[PDB]
Design a protein around this ligand. Structure first.
Ligand SMILES: *[C@]1(C(=O)N[C@H](C(=O)O)[C@@H](C)CC)O[C@@H]1C(=O)OCC
Length: 251
């Protein structure tokens, strides 16, 4: 395995890999980490480009994935992709795809032109229909995964998985000092626990002698490093290597 790897550079024909979304005022990170990596993998293993609907995952999976805007289970999300499939759907107000995200973007622990994010947000309804004007039908727009698995808490195995199959979904414990991240390799030193947070791991590298994971957050582009961040790799820091999940799309 190489010393560094950036899925964005390795798969130039898959622009979703470079995208950063906004989960809005809803605890749907579990769904976002999933549909983002799934979008990347559909492109990587089908060379078609599809903006997988965070809305479809968030609203229609149900108990198998947890509790919607109240938090969920990453592995459960990939299971939904293999069982019921996922339709397309872009950003809020984009009118792209079958079911675009219905929760407005907001400012995540930063100042900006958007309204500040609020912790309170309700899970939208599971509507098995597409926006007006879009074709095909909801049922016909479903993209299925043909496998859903969990990668071991093993740095090398995680790197190998990304290297061969593309970005994966992961999760780590968020402490308040992470909220103000701007650059460099994040290492937890202070702050109260904020809870678990699912994200998308798309690579790795070494900065100033510190090994790290290249991660895409779902708090828009004005948070962190253009929406991305780097976190210590190899020590299961904040549990970053303890909940890796992925899967492969059907042919
Ligand atoms: C992940 C989530 O969306 N968390 C919030 C966010 O704004 O990103 C806060 C609470 C984290 C600082 O409740 C979601 C989940 O499914 O967590 C378990 C992985």
């Amino acid at each position: 395995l190489p010393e560094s790897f950036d899925a964005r550079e390795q798969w130039p024909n898959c622009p979703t890999i470079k995208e950063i979304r906004d989960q809005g005022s809803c605890g749907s990170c579990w769904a976002f980490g999933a549909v983002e990596a799934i979008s990347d993998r559909i492109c990587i293993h089908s060379n078609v480009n599809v903006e997988v609907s965070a809305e479809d995952m968030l609203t229609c999976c149900g108990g198998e994935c947890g509790d919607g805007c109240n938090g969920g289970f990453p592995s459960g999300a990939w299971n939904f992709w293999t069982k019921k499939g996922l339709v397309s759907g872009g950003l809020y107000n984009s009118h792209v795809g079958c079911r675009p995200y219905s929760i407005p973007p907001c400012e995540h622990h930063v100042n900006g032109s958007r309204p500040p994010c609020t912790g309170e947000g309700d899970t939208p309804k599971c509507s098995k229909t597409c926006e007006p004007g879009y074709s095909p039908s909801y049922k016909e727009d479903k993209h299925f995964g043909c496998s859903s698995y969990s990668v071991a808490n093993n740095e090398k195995e995680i790197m190998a998985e990304i290297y061969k199959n593309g970005p994966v979904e992961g999760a780590f414990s968020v402490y308040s000092d992470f909220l103000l991240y701007k650059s460099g390799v994040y290492q937890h030193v202070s702050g109260e626990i904020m809870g678990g947070h699912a994200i998308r791991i798309l690579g790795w590298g070494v900065e100033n002698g510190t090994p790290y994971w290249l991660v895409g957050n779902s708090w828009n582009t004005d948070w962190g490093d253009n929406g991305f961040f780097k976190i210590l790799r190899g020590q299961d820091h904040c549990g970053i290597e303890s909940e890796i999940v992925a899967g492969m799309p059907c042919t």
